[PDB]
Amino acid sequence: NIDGYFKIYSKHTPINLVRDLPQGFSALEPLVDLPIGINITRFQTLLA
Amino acid sequence: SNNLDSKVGGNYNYLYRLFRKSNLKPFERDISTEIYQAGSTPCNGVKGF
Numbered sequence: 001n002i003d004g005y006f007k008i009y010s011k012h013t014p015i016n017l018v019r020d021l022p023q024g025f026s027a028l029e030p031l032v033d034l035p036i037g038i039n040i041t042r043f044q045t046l047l048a
Numbered sequence: 049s050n051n052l053d054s055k056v057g058g059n060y061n062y063l064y065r066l067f068r069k070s071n072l073k074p075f076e077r078d079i080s081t082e083i084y085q086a087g088s089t090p091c092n093g094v095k096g097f
């Protein structure tokens with residue numbers, strides 16, 4: 001969040017690894033920005 | 049806005065914040081109705097000295 005604008009950047013890349021976070025390089029593109037104006041102190045994810 | 053927002057006894061439906069601990073941030077909006085501590089004492093419940 002910057003001054004109330006909450007922003008997302010992301011990247012999905014294919015891989016083939018069965019160990020820690022793949023050592024290598026890429027950049028996230030900007031994806032969305034929503035003008036929510038809220039405070040965010042903290043967060044949680046959502047499983048299914 | 050005289051004509052639209054004024055009432056002869058008083059249009060007291062309009063509020064402003066008058067007492068708080070610090071000044072707010074750019075484009076912050078604060079919806080609190082919690083009691084301000086104007087003395088050194090902590091304040092608890094509805095009202096107090």
Ligand SMILES: *[C@@H]1O[C@H](CO)[C@@H](O[C@@H]2O[C@H](CO)[C@@H](O)[C@H](O)[C@H]2NC(C)=O)[C@H](O)[C@H]1NC(C)=O
Pocket residue numbers: 039040041073076
């Ligand atoms: C967003 O919320 C947090 C937490 O409620 C605020 O930080 C608190 O501020 C008070 C007063 O300074 C402190 O006593 C708390 O210990 C703080 N806690 C945390 C986790 O920060 C923060 O100021 C709020 N931000 C805005 C912009 O209102």
